[PDB]
Amino acid sequence: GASKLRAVLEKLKLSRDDISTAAGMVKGVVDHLLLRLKCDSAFRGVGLLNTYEHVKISAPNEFDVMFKLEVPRIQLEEYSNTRAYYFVKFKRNPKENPLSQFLEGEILSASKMLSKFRKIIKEEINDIKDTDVIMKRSPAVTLLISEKISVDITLALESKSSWPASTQEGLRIQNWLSAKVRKQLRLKPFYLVPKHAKGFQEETWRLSFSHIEKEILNNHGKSKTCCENKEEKCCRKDCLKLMKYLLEQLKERFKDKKHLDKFSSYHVKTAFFHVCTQNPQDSQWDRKDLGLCFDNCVTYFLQCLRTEKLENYFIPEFNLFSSNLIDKRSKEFLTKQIEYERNNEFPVFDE
Numbered sequence: 001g002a003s004k005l006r007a008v009l010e011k012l013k014l015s016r017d018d019i020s021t022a023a024g025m026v027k028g029v030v031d032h033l034l035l036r037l038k039c040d041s042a043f044r045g046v047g048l049l050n051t052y053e054h055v056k057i058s059a060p061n062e063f064d065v066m067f068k069l070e071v072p073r074i075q076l077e078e079y080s081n082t083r084a085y086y087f088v089k090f091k092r093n094p095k096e097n098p099l100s101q102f103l104e105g106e107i108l109s110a111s112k113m114l115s116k117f118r119k120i121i122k123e124e125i126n127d128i129k130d131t132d133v134i135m136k137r138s139p140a141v142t143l144l145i146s147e148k149i150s151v152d153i154t155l156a157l158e159s160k161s162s163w164p165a166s167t168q169e170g171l172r173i174q175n176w177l178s179a180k181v182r183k184q185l186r187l188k189p190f191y192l193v194p195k196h197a198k199g200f201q202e203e204t205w206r207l208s209f210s211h212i213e214k215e216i217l218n219n220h221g222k223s224k225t226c227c228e229n230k231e232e233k234c235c236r237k238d239c240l241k242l243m244k245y246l247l248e249q250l251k252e253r254f255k256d257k258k259h260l261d262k263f264s265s266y267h268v269k270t271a272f273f274h275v276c277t278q279n280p281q282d283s284q285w286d287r288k289d290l291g292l293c294f295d296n297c298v299t300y301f302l303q304c305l306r307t308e309k310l311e312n313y314f315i316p317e318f319n320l321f322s323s324n325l326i327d328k329r330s331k332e333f334l335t336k337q338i339e340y341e342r343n344n345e346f347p348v349f350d351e
C-alpha cells in the first residue's frame with residue numbers, strides 16, 4: 001500500500017548531505033563566472049536567478065543554474081503562432097542599449113548572444129584551476145566538475161513587463177491557491193530562454209516561468225497553514241518526489257535503447273500541477289492517502305502520454321506532448337513501461 005512508498009522517500013532523505021556538499025561546488029564556480037561576465041559591456045546586468053537558492057535539481061548529478069539579463073523596454077513579436085516561441089524587438093530608441101551588439105535590424109539574435117556567452121565562459125573555465133571544470137557539445141552551457149557533477153547553465157532574458165497574451169488562461173490556480181495569489185504571481189517578471197523551434201530557427205526565444213515553481217511548492221495548500229502542524233500534513237511534495245524518481249529510474253533502466261531521451265522532470269512537474277488543479281482541496285492530498293494520491297498522478301500522466309496531450313501549465317495552447325516534440329512511438333513505449341509498474345505495485349522502487 002502506502003508503506004512501500006514511505007521507505008523510498010525516507011531513503012531519498014539520506015542522500016541530502018551528499019547533494020549539499022556538491023551544491024557548494026556549483027555555487028563556487030558560478031560566482032567566478034558572474035564576476036567575469038559583469039566586466040563585459042553586454043553582460044554587465046547579468047545576475048543569478050533563484051529557482052538550494054540559485055541551484056535547481058533535474059537529475060541526481062545534474063544541476064540547472066539560470067543567469068538573468070535585465071532587458072528594459074522590450075517588445076515581443078509572436079513566432080509562427082507557436083504560443084511559446086517569440087522574437088525580441090525594442091519598443092523605441094531612447095538611449096542605445098548595451099545589448100545592441102547582437103541586433104539584426106530590429107530582431108535580437110539568440111545564436112549571437114549565446115555564442116559570446118559560451119566564449120567568455122570557455123575562457124574563465126581554464127582560469128579557475130581549483131576543480132576540474134570542462135564544457136560539453138541543447139540551448140544550455142553544460143559543465144562537468146570532478147567528472148561527476150554536471151551543471152547546465154542557461155542564459156535568460158528578464159522582462160519585468162506584464163506576461164504575454166498566450167499566458168492569459170494559464171496558471172489555473174484560482175480554485176486552489178486563489179484568484180488573489182494568481183494576480184500576485186502574474187505581477188512577477190517573466191523569462192525568455194534561447195530554446196529554438198524545430199534545421200532550427202536560432203533567433204526565437206521560449207517563455208520560461210521556472211521561478212514560479214518555488215513560489216507554489218513552498219505554499220502549496222488551499223489552507224494557509226498546510227504542513228505547518230501535525231494535523232494539516234499533506235503529501236503534495238511527496239507525490240512530486242515519487243513522480244520525479246519514477247521517470248528518473250525508468251530513464252536509468254532504459255538507457256539500453258535511448259527511447260525516453262526527450263522526457264524530463266519538467267513533463268512530470270507539469271502533469272503533477274495539473275492534478276493539483278483537479279484536486280484543489282487539502283483533503284484530496286492527505287498523508288495517509290499517499291498511495292491513492294500517487295496513483296492519481298500516475299493515472300493523469302498515463303492518460304497524458306496515451307492522448308498525446310500535456311498542456312504547458314502557463315501556456316494552455318502549447319502541447320508538450322505534440323507529434324512535433326515527442327514521437328508517437330516514445331509515448332506508447334513510456335505508456336507501456338508505467339502501465340507495467342502501476343499493474344505490478346511499482347517494482348522499480350524495491351532497493
Ligand SMILES: Cc1ccc(-c2cc(C(=O)O)c3nc(CN4CCOCC4)[nH]c3c2)c(Cl)c1
Pocket residue numbers: 064207208209210211212213214216264266269270273313314
Ligand atoms: C506551478 C509551476 C511552476 C513552474 C513550472 C515550470 C515552468 C518552466 C517553464 O520554463 O515554463 C520550467 N522549465 C523547467 C526546466 N527546463 C526544462 C526545459 O529545458 C530547460 C529547463 N522547469 C520548469 C517548471 C511548472 Cl511545470 C509548474
Ligand SMILES: [Zn+2]
Pocket residue numbers: 220221226227232233234235236
Ligand atoms: Zn501541504
